[PDB]
Scaffold this motif. Structure first.
Motif, PDB file in Angstrom:
ATOM      1  N   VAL A 113      53.822  31.851 -21.788  1.00  0.00           N
ATOM      2  CA  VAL A 113      53.587  30.658 -22.596  1.00  0.00           C
ATOM      3  C   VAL A 113      54.855  29.810 -22.693  1.00  0.00           C
ATOM      4  O   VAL A 113      54.818  28.598 -22.473  1.00  0.00           O
ATOM      5  CB  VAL A 113      53.079  31.025 -24.010  1.00  0.00           C
ATOM      6  N   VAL A 114      55.968  30.459 -23.027  1.00  0.00           N
ATOM      7  CA  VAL A 114      57.259  29.790 -23.152  1.00  0.00           C
ATOM      8  C   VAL A 114      58.303  30.558 -22.345  1.00  0.00           C
ATOM      9  O   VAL A 114      58.417  31.782 -22.468  1.00  0.00           O
ATOM     10  CB  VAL A 114      57.719  29.688 -24.629  1.00  0.00           C
ATOM     11  N   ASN A 115      59.035  29.832 -21.504  1.00  0.00           N
ATOM     12  CA  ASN A 115      60.182  30.380 -20.794  1.00  0.00           C
ATOM     13  C   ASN A 115      61.479  29.783 -21.336  1.00  0.00           C
ATOM     14  O   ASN A 115      61.546  28.584 -21.624  1.00  0.00           O
ATOM     15  CB  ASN A 115      60.062  30.117 -19.288  1.00  0.00           C
ATOM     16  N   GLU A 116      62.491  30.636 -21.482  1.00  0.00           N
ATOM     17  CA  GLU A 116      63.872  30.239 -21.830  1.00  0.00           C
ATOM     18  C   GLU A 116      64.071  29.475 -23.149  1.00  0.00           C
ATOM     19  O   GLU A 116      64.786  28.461 -23.178  1.00  0.00           O
ATOM     20  CB  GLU A 116      64.534  29.509 -20.652  1.00  0.00           C
ATOM     21  N   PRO A 117      63.477  29.975 -24.258  1.00  0.00           N
ATOM     22  CA  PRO A 117      63.680  29.279 -25.537  1.00  0.00           C
ATOM     23  C   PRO A 117      65.150  29.192 -25.959  1.00  0.00           C
ATOM     24  O   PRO A 117      65.549  28.202 -26.579  1.00  0.00           O
ATOM     25  CB  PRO A 117      62.887  30.130 -26.534  1.00  0.00           C
ATOM     26  N   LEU A 118      65.949  30.204 -25.614  1.00  0.00           N
ATOM     27  CA  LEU A 118      67.372  30.222 -25.975  1.00  0.00           C
ATOM     28  C   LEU A 118      68.253  29.441 -25.000  1.00  0.00           C
ATOM     29  O   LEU A 118      69.408  29.121 -25.310  1.00  0.00           O
ATOM     30  CB  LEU A 118      67.887  31.661 -26.097  1.00  0.00           C
ATOM     31  N   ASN A 119      67.701  29.113 -23.835  1.00  0.00           N
ATOM     32  CA  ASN A 119      68.497  28.530 -22.759  1.00  0.00           C
ATOM     33  C   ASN A 119      68.115  27.112 -22.323  1.00  0.00           C
ATOM     34  O   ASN A 119      68.988  26.309 -21.978  1.00  0.00           O
ATOM     35  CB  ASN A 119      68.525  29.493 -21.574  1.00  0.00           C
ATOM     36  N   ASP A 120      66.821  26.811 -22.349  1.00  0.00           N
ATOM     37  CA  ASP A 120      66.314  25.536 -21.866  1.00  0.00           C
ATOM     38  C   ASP A 120      65.016  25.146 -22.575  1.00  0.00           C
ATOM     39  O   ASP A 120      63.939  25.241 -21.988  1.00  0.00           O
ATOM     40  CB  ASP A 120      66.125  25.578 -20.341  1.00  0.00           C
ATOM     41  N   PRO A 121      65.118  24.702 -23.845  1.00  0.00           N
ATOM     42  CA  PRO A 121      63.948  24.136 -24.515  1.00  0.00           C
ATOM     43  C   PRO A 121      63.586  22.793 -23.877  1.00  0.00           C
ATOM     44  O   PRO A 121      64.450  22.161 -23.263  1.00  0.00           O
ATOM     45  CB  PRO A 121      64.429  23.932 -25.959  1.00  0.00           C
ATOM     46  N   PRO A 122      62.321  22.357 -24.007  1.00  0.00           N
ATOM     47  CA  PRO A 122      61.894  21.084 -23.422  1.00  0.00           C
ATOM     48  C   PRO A 122      62.356  19.881 -24.251  1.00  0.00           C
ATOM     49  O   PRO A 122      61.527  19.107 -24.727  1.00  0.00           O
ATOM     50  CB  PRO A 122      60.371  21.193 -23.441  1.00  0.00           C
ATOM     51  N   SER A 123      63.671  19.731 -24.409  1.00  0.00           N
ATOM     52  CA  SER A 123      64.240  18.695 -25.274  1.00  0.00           C
ATOM     53  C   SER A 123      65.066  17.642 -24.537  1.00  0.00           C
ATOM     54  O   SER A 123      65.611  16.730 -25.170  1.00  0.00           O
ATOM     55  CB  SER A 123      65.106  19.347 -26.344  1.00  0.00           C
ATOM     56  N   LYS A 124      65.166  17.772 -23.215  1.00  0.00           N
ATOM     57  CA  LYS A 124      65.966  16.860 -22.396  1.00  0.00           C
ATOM     58  C   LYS A 124      65.106  15.766 -21.807  1.00  0.00           C
ATOM     59  O   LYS A 124      63.947  15.992 -21.459  1.00  0.00           O
ATOM     60  CB  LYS A 124      66.657  17.600 -21.248  1.00  0.00           C
ATOM     61  N   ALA A 125      65.693  14.584 -21.675  1.00  0.00           N
ATOM     62  CA  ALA A 125      64.999  13.442 -21.107  1.00  0.00           C
ATOM     63  C   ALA A 125      65.474  13.142 -19.683  1.00  0.00           C
ATOM     64  O   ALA A 125      65.363  12.010 -19.220  1.00  0.00           O
ATOM     65  CB  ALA A 125      65.157  12.226 -22.008  1.00  0.00           C
ATOM     66  N   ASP A 126      66.000  14.150 -18.984  1.00  0.00           N
ATOM     67  CA  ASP A 126      66.291  13.970 -17.559  1.00  0.00           C
ATOM     68  C   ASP A 126      65.012  14.170 -16.736  1.00  0.00           C
ATOM     69  O   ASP A 126      63.946  14.434 -17.303  1.00  0.00           O
ATOM     70  CB  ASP A 126      67.472  14.832 -17.078  1.00  0.00           C
ATOM     71  N   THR A 127      65.122  14.024 -15.418  1.00  0.00           N
ATOM     72  CA  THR A 127      63.959  13.916 -14.523  1.00  0.00           C
ATOM     73  C   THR A 127      62.766  14.798 -14.919  1.00  0.00           C
ATOM     74  O   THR A 127      61.668  14.291 -15.192  1.00  0.00           O
ATOM     75  CB  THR A 127      64.357  14.169 -13.052  1.00  0.00           C
ATOM     76  N   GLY A 128      62.986  16.110 -14.955  1.00  0.00           N
ATOM     77  CA  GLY A 128      61.927  17.045 -15.304  1.00  0.00           C
ATOM     78  C   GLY A 128      62.098  17.727 -16.649  1.00  0.00           C
ATOM     79  O   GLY A 128      61.569  18.815 -16.860  1.00  0.00           O
ATOM     80  N   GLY A 129      62.825  17.087 -17.563  1.00  0.00           N
ATOM     81  CA  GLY A 129      63.139  17.689 -18.863  1.00  0.00           C
ATOM     82  C   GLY A 129      61.983  17.796 -19.847  1.00  0.00           C
ATOM     83  O   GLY A 129      62.034  18.586 -20.796  1.00  0.00           O
ATOM     84  N   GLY A 130      60.943  16.993 -19.637  1.00  0.00           N
ATOM     85  CA  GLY A 130      59.768  17.014 -20.506  1.00  0.00           C
ATOM     86  C   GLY A 130      59.960  16.241 -21.795  1.00  0.00           C
ATOM     87  O   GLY A 130      59.137  15.394 -22.140  1.00  0.00           O
ATOM     88  N   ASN A 131      61.045  16.542 -22.511  1.00  0.00           N
ATOM     89  CA  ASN A 131      61.399  15.836 -23.740  1.00  0.00           C
ATOM     90  C   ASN A 131      60.233  15.836 -24.745  1.00  0.00           C
ATOM     91  O   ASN A 131      59.970  14.831 -25.404  1.00  0.00           O
ATOM     92  CB  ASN A 131      61.848  14.402 -23.397  1.00  0.00           C
TER      93      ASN A 131
END
Ligand code: XYP
Ligand code: CA
Length: 303
Positions: A113-131
């Protein structure tokens, strides 16, 4: 016959174009390497390219091996178009994505369901960041609201599927394990999680950290009562001897832990993620490296 044919737990591998040849002769479980990522499926909004994910799923079905869906929510390889949408619209997109996957793939053995909560949350607005962190409630009162909301969505859309959380650099430190355990516990409070995943890539298992530390941290996670899976295992091979020595040191720690219900290698042929670091177990010419020779013998002796 796959290495783990007569074992009590599976030994699988990431599946992709380069990993395809001879796959089922070695491995007895799979994870799609890239095809199940939202940005792989829905690169262009509202047109779903299922082809690569279909391949992995159908291959798993045809070869009668467990299929781990990878991955619903993550902070990279997300659709480029979603990062500029309002949280209200992002959430509806997330809901549709969950429904779409649930509808198409009824026989998922483990849903990441969720990968890398401690390392890469979907909070970035770069190309594939999701944001799209705020579409899932952001951090909220617990610090991990967005993880909770992701698993709530998962329970809703996949009401009979085992749900898994996944991350890296966890067992390599007590501090990371304690941080990750907090997330698992918050999920457990709402009975939202069924399995705990730790990646165990090469960078997590260097000789800088004692094997006893990994082991103690596996014990710490095991105390949840949840099965543990090692999800993305690889070991670099700048030389054959290093890779072999590292396999001997590292692999049995995880394989022999009673809480570990399976291990998935993150590729085995050239073209795997850690290609430049030569983590592959088979060479460009198709020959098996000493680490793979050992692994076959080790697994056969440890069922
Ligand atoms: O192909 C890569 C995949 O192996 C890794 O898991 O995620 C990043 C991708 O670029
Ligand atoms: Ca959509």
């Amino acid at each position: 016959a796959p290495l783990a044919a007569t074992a009590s737990k599976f030994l699988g591998c990431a599946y992709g174009a380069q990993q395809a040849p001879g796959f089922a002769q070695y491995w007895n479980k799979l994870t799609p390497e890239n095809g199940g990522k939202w940005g792989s499926v829905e690169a262009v909004r509202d047109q779903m390219d299922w082809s690569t994910l279909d391949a992995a799923y159908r291959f798993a079905q045809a070869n009668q091996m467990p299929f781990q869906m990878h991955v619903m929510v993550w902070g990279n390889q997300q659709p480029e178009w979603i990062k500029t949408l309002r949280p209200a619209e992002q959430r509806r997109e997330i809901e549709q994505w969950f429904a779409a996957v649930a509808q198409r793939y009824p026989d998922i053995a483990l849903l990441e369901v969720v990968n890398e909560p401690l390392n890469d949350p979907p909070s970035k607005a770069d190309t594939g960041g999701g944001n799209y962190l705020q579409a899932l409630g952001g951090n909220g009162d617990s610090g991990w609201e967005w993880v909770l909301q992701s698993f709530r969505l998962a329970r809703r859309h996949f009401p009979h599927t085992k749900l898994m959380i996944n991350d890296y650099s966890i067992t390599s430190s007590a501090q990371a394990t304690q941080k990750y355990l907090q997330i698992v516990r918050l999920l457990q409070r709402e009975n939202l999680v069924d399995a705990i995943g730790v990646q165990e890539h090469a960078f997590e298992t260097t000789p800088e950290v004692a094997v006893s530390v990994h082991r103690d941290n596996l014990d710490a996670l095991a105390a949840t009562g949840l099965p543990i899976y090692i999800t993305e295992f690889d070991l670099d091979g700048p030389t054959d001897a290093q890779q072999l020595a590292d396999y001997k040191r590292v692999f049995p720690v995880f394989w022999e832990h009673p809480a570990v219900h399976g291990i998935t290698l993150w590729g085995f042929r050239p073209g795997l993620w850690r290609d430049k670091e030569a983590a592959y177990l088979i060479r460009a010419d198709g020959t098996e490296r000493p680490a793979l020779t050992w692994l076959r013998d080790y697994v056969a002796a440890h069922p």
